Design an enzyme around this catalytic site. Structure first.
Site, PDB file in Angstrom:
ATOM      1  N   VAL A 104      95.916  55.518 -32.665  1.00  0.00           N
ATOM      2  CA  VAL A 104      96.859  54.482 -33.187  1.00  0.00           C
ATOM      3  C   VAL A 104      96.326  53.719 -34.407  1.00  0.00           C
ATOM      4  O   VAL A 104      97.170  53.115 -35.043  1.00  0.00           O
ATOM      5  CB  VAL A 104      97.311  53.506 -32.088  1.00  0.00           C
ATOM      6  CG1 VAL A 104      97.673  54.251 -30.817  1.00  0.00           C
ATOM      7  CG2 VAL A 104      96.287  52.447 -31.798  1.00  0.00           C
ATOM      8  N   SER A 153      92.767  52.931 -37.522  1.00  0.00           N
ATOM      9  CA  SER A 153      91.393  52.979 -38.083  1.00  0.00           C
ATOM     10  C   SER A 153      91.064  51.648 -38.756  1.00  0.00           C
ATOM     11  O   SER A 153      91.973  51.007 -39.308  1.00  0.00           O
ATOM     12  CB  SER A 153      91.232  54.102 -39.044  1.00  0.00           C
ATOM     13  OG  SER A 153      91.356  55.342 -38.372  1.00  0.00           O
ATOM     14  N   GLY A 154      89.793  51.266 -38.701  1.00  0.00           N
ATOM     15  CA  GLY A 154      89.277  49.964 -39.152  1.00  0.00           C
ATOM     16  C   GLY A 154      87.927  50.154 -39.791  1.00  0.00           C
ATOM     17  O   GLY A 154      87.419  51.286 -39.725  1.00  0.00           O
ATOM     18  N   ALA A 155      87.384  49.109 -40.416  1.00  0.00           N
ATOM     19  CA  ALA A 155      86.027  49.118 -41.009  1.00  0.00           C
ATOM     20  C   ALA A 155      85.021  49.442 -39.919  1.00  0.00           C
ATOM     21  O   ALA A 155      84.054  50.145 -40.231  1.00  0.00           O
ATOM     22  CB  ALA A 155      85.670  47.787 -41.604  1.00  0.00           C
ATOM     23  N   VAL A 207      90.920  53.109 -32.989  1.00  0.00           N
ATOM     24  CA  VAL A 207      91.640  52.757 -31.736  1.00  0.00           C
ATOM     25  C   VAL A 207      92.542  53.921 -31.293  1.00  0.00           C
ATOM     26  O   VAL A 207      93.162  54.576 -32.140  1.00  0.00           O
ATOM     27  CB  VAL A 207      92.414  51.446 -31.937  1.00  0.00           C
ATOM     28  CG1 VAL A 207      93.058  50.954 -30.653  1.00  0.00           C
ATOM     29  CG2 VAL A 207      91.497  50.383 -32.493  1.00  0.00           C
ATOM     30  N   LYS A 267      88.980  50.910 -28.330  1.00  0.00           N
ATOM     31  CA  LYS A 267      88.319  50.953 -29.658  1.00  0.00           C
ATOM     32  C   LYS A 267      86.952  51.617 -29.515  1.00  0.00           C
ATOM     33  O   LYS A 267      86.123  51.027 -28.795  1.00  0.00           O
ATOM     34  CB  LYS A 267      88.092  49.555 -30.233  1.00  0.00           C
ATOM     35  CG  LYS A 267      87.380  49.559 -31.584  1.00  0.00           C
ATOM     36  CD  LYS A 267      87.052  48.194 -32.143  1.00  0.00           C
ATOM     37  CE  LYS A 267      88.266  47.419 -32.602  1.00  0.00           C
ATOM     38  NZ  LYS A 267      87.886  46.454 -33.660  1.00  0.00           N
ATOM     39  N   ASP A 298      91.814  36.897 -40.166  1.00  0.00           N
ATOM     40  CA  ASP A 298      92.521  38.125 -40.616  1.00  0.00           C
ATOM     41  C   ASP A 298      93.840  38.313 -39.835  1.00  0.00           C
ATOM     42  O   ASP A 298      94.187  39.464 -39.497  1.00  0.00           O
ATOM     43  CB  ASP A 298      91.546  39.313 -40.637  1.00  0.00           C
ATOM     44  CG  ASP A 298      92.122  40.549 -41.311  1.00  0.00           C
ATOM     45  OD1 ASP A 298      92.777  40.378 -42.363  1.00  0.00           O
ATOM     46  OD2 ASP A 298      91.990  41.666 -40.736  1.00  0.00           O
TER      47      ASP A 298
END
EC number: 2.7.11.24
Length: 347
Positions: A27, A29-31, A35, A50, A147
């Site tokens: 579902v 993508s992040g730094a 997830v 995550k 954020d």
């Protein structure tokens, strides 16, 4: 011997999760991690997992992953995402290289809701109300999220909302380390890259989100930091002790002092389809002076929410403690404090 865990390639990367968590759909993508959604075999409950991006690459990467975990673990509130679980398939401290956080999965977010236009005009007071209930709690633990965006507001079938993604949040009195990437919803002091600011940076972000919900159009666009500030001045007007003082930068001082000088446009004319009450709250959230910004509780006590007849009270919560995470630790010391947190979370 029953392993506890199975392996599944997901987007060409190897997830190893508890036997209980089945049907891994990707579902996000992040730094700091990726997830997947999954079903909890026990209960049927939908669930977000995550997989932290290489959290033990450095002292400070381990420290930020520890901080994210400790924060999520701290925060128990209807409108704030919570930590259900955290595990590693590594069977020993000497093999410990990757670990997984497990939150509820609400089913969608705003923004996915707004993209496909499904955000009801009637749903907006209740959604903005839940954000602020949530923020009132996060701030009361003395934390700044830093954020807030549509992506980080999960919403279920019955329009119930939870604030996501604490991977940039920091204790409110501490230093604001970490780069905020997301551009549209950040307050001036984030854009200015201050090392100290207050919780009213999150109130600014809510303002930007509310406006965008009402008008289906992002309030502030901007190529880079300095331009995104120009855009803000077009809705707010120019200030005095900023462009002749606090930009720590002659080039930027000049730009602001050498541009066409217009003053606060009436929000009514930008938000042409907004309750005059709504406009009013928005004018209170989108102030440059952070001390003048309405706070989470001040916002909820505004007339725009009077219709919710929910006095509630002021749900008391413990302030988070900086100090245990700020303890100097080598990488091995971080692995051992994190592995202690995993063991604490065995089922």
């Amino acid at each position: 011997n029953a392993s506890g865990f199975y392996r599944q390639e997901v987007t060409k990367t190897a997830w190893e999760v508890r036997a209980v968590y089945r049907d891994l759909q990707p579902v996000g993508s992040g730094a700091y991690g990726a997830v997947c959604s999954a079903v909890d075999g026990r209960t049927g409950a939908k669930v977000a997992i995550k997989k932290l991006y290489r959290p033990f690459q450095s002292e400070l990467f381990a420290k930020r992953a520890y901080r994210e975990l400790r924060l999520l673990k701290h925060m128990r509130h209807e409108n704030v995402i919570g930590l259900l679980d955290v595990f590693t398939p590594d069977e020993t401290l000497d093999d410990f290289t990757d670990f997984y956080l497990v939150m509820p999965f609400m089913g969608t977010d705003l923004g996915k809701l707004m993209k496909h236009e499904k955000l009801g005009e009637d749903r907006i007071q209740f959604l903005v109300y839940q954000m602020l209930k949530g923020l009132r709690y996060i701030h009361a633990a003395g934390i700044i999220h830093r954020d807030l965006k549509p992506g980080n507001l999960a919403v279920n079938e019955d329009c119930e909302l939870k604030i996501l993604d604490f991977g940039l949040a920091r204790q409110a009195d501490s230093e604001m380390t970490g780069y905020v990437v997301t551009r549209w919803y950040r307050a001036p002091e984030v854009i200015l890259n201050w090392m100290r600011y207050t919780q009213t940076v999150d109130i600014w972000s809510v303002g930007c989100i509310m406006a965008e919900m009402i008008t289906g159009k992002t309030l502030f666009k901007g190529s880079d930091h300095l331009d995104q500030l120009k855009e803000i001045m077009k809705v707010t007007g120019t200030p005095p002790a900023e462009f002749v003082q606090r930009l720590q930068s002659d080039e930027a001082k000049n730009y602001m002092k050498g541009l066409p000088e217009l003053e606060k446009k009436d929000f009514a004319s930008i938000l042409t389809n907004a309750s005059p009450l709504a406009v009013n709250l928005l004018e209170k959230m989108l102030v440059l002076d952070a001390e003048q910004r309405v706070t989470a509780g001040e916002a909820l006590a505004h007339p725009y929410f009077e219709s919710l007849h929910d006095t509630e009270d002021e749900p008391q919560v413990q302030k988070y403690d900086d100090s245990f995470d700020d303890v100097d630790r080598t990488l091995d010391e971080w692995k051992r404090v994190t592995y202690k947190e995993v063991l604490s979370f065995k089922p």
